[PDB]
From a paper:
A multiprotein complex in the outer membrane called β-Barrel Assembly Machine (BAM) then mediates OMP folding and insertion. In E. coli, the BAM complex is composed of BamA, a β-barrel OMP itself previously known as Omp85/YaeT, and the lipoproteins BamB, C, D and E (previously YfgL, NlpB, YfiO and SmpA respectively). BamB is a membrane-associated lipoprotein with lipids attached to the N-terminal cysteine in the mature protein predicted to anchor it to the membrane. Taken together, the structural analysis and mutagenic testing of BamB suggests that its main function is to bind and modulate BamA, rather than directly interact with nascent OMPs.
A lipid-free, soluble form of mature Pseudomonas aeruginosa BamB (paBamA, amino acids 19–380) was expressed in E. coli, purified to homogeneity and crystallized as described in Methods. The crystals belong to trigonal space group P3221 and contain a single paBamB molecule per asymmetric unit. The final model contains amino acids 28 to 380 (plus two extra amino acids, PG, at the C-terminus resulting from the cloning procedure) with excellent refinement statistics as shown in Table 1. Despite these irregularities in the inner strands, the propeller displays a central pore that is about 20Å wide at the “top” and narrows to about 8Å at the center.
Author numbering: 28 to 382
Write the structure that this text describes.
Amino acid sequence: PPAELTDFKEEVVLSKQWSRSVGDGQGDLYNLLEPAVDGSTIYAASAEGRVMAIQRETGDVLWKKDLERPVSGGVGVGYGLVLVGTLRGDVIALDEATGKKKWTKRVNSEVLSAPATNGDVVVVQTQDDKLIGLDAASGDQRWIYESTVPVLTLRGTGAPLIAGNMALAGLASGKVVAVDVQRGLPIWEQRVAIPQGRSELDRVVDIDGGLLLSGDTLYVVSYQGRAAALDVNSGRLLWQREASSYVGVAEGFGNIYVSQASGSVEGLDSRGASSLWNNDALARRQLSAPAVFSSNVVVGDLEGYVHLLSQVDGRFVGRERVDSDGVRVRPLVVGSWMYVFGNGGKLVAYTIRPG
């Protein structure tokens, strides 16, 4: 039973600029569809197959597309495409400016995360730990990286990231890899997660490394029950923490901030050595990954609240109910704006009052 909400002295108040419903949001997915921004537009998909492009400051709908099929991985955007994956293993590319379908490629396995693109190749990470590179123009397969090698009881829900000429991925098997984005050949591989054993051969578990790319640092914080940061160019371990682990991580003010779904949020130093503060009060509230919005750390919970915590102290300074079906997706902060995507599909844009 989630911990009851606690009283606090309100110091930070959100101003709701616009809200738009996109389909059924996450529907019955166990994984998450994440909206993404490119320039002045925010793009969002829903489990029912509805995809939208919205002017991110006004809320004006630029285009909608009803794909009429089970979208399970999404939004990828860039270089003129919006990209989603389906539970049937389809990767569908839509024109970023009009929403017109450009192509569809049926891939080997379910796609449970947003494809990435550099405008030449679309990189798709599958439930069964393959990275597939597709031609951005046609969808035709360019390369495949399959060290998978199993396993039927894990689902990888990590999204691939393009750094330079590298595609990075945290695989369900617990290994982070960097491959050549043009050829699909490995550049480095680094085991971060604790090795699997058996005795979870009778259960299906979803695995995500919780990747966050910031410059030369790739944070990998969501493998149980460890957390690490890697050099993006070599895979070298910069630091690690045992006895974790975290729903996700965010940077701000020279520190990092983590949440643990089970209901703590914590600030740590740059190198995750020492703890700056810890707020336990959201005990069983099933937190999203954290975002830093101005001087606040923010997390969504199962009841649909976003909580704002002081970056200095961890104390509650703000709270806003967004979508009562819950907020599981990391709030998306772009400068002075924050976009929260509720489980029922409410996409809401906030600024901090009086701005």
